[PDB]
Amino acid sequence: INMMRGDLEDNLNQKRRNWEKNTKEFNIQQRNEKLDYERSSHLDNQAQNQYHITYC
Amino acid sequence: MREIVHIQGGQCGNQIGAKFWEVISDEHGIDPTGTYHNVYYNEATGGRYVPRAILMDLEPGTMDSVRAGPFGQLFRPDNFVFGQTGAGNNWAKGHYTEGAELIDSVLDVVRKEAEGCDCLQGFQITHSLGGGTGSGMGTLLISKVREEYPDRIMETFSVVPSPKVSDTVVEPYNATLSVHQLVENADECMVIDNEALYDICFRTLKLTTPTYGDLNHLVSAAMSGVTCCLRFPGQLNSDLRKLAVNLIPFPRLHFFMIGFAPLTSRGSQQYRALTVPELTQQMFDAKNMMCAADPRHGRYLTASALFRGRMSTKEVDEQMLNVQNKNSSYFVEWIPNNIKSSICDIPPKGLKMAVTFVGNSTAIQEMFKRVAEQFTAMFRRKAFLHWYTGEGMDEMEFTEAESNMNDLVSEYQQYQDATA
């Protein structure tokens, strides 16, 4: 019974670390999508500025 | 549902109205025939749109004026009322004898036009303060319509006489006689004077030959921006009444100042990336406003700013706070947080950012002071007074008008100098 309890708690801790690494995957994806967002918005800003200034 | 009739008057008022209607047609994507490509326009058979405006004047010249310019076919002949003579730069000839017999008829064309709306947010007038026709008729009409619909507000997009660069010799009499009555039954007297318009069009756009078309177009842009935040959705919406509530502390300190942003020429257009703080630095500059009165020479009782386009509201509010806080002297103390903001969601035609600034400020009593100076100088000698006293006018009304003007300027001074 001691061996079984040890094995079960080991598996539970493994599941914990697995979910933690899942959340870290998600966080890195979030950061990179935010960088995509900001660069695309910068190019859109340059586009609107050209459109407004060349408006003679 | 919050509609606005657009009453005009006089030659200047009529030209400004035509320019404003064509600019609004440009914004709302209409063509000079009235086909798409309820607050201002009205629907009409065959998908056509007709402006909800009336056009009054004693001389039929302005009739051909608003016919000649583009977008002249948007209007309807039922709203072309026109006398024959023309008051010829005489105030009383548009307020007592000759103008009267028109205003009655005009009342009709208003009463079968206002009730056409269902929830009328108020009127708006476009006229001059010196010309006899515009000033006199608009004053009588303001009287009548305030007697009729006291619940609605009546903006008066008025162009005060050019203070120093005078084109006529009878400005002060007309301006004083008209203001004496305008101060009673008006709610938003936004003053404009051609001195400031030439100043802007010279020292901010380096233009070659500024004709009246360009000044009318600029005042048109400001006029549109004043209520475009109502015409469209936004993150923080306003109207014609929120402005009034946030702009006047007492029932007769309601005379405003107007400013537009941004404005540059091609040389400067190449430079100066477009960003909200630059817009603030442009709008809160002295010479960047439609009134020849350096606003530093007075205190801002209160001031609202309507933005158009997409931006970050935090930047707007933080710039407003920074500018009201750093220059605390030019602003007034006994009222706190005296600046106001609003933000629309659709900017003008290809203009990523647009700001319209309206400010009730005691720096405009100087204009009335100098106009009354000219008046009392021309009245001590009874100069050019027979032209008026021959038409039923007496000489007591002039003293009453000047004393009311001085009471107004004394109110400005007194409740500027107050403290807490």
Ligand SMILES: Nc1nc2c(ncn2[C@@H]2O[C@H](COP(=O)(O)OP(=O)(O)O)[C@@H](O)[C@H]2O)c(=O)[nH]1
């Ligand atoms: N921005 C602008 N100002 C004008 C115009 N016409 C006149 N003004 C000025 O307004 C004053 C006289 O107004 P006016 O319209 O001629 O008098 P009215 O004939 O009774 O309507 C004068 O100071 C003119 O210089 C115009 O078309 N546009």
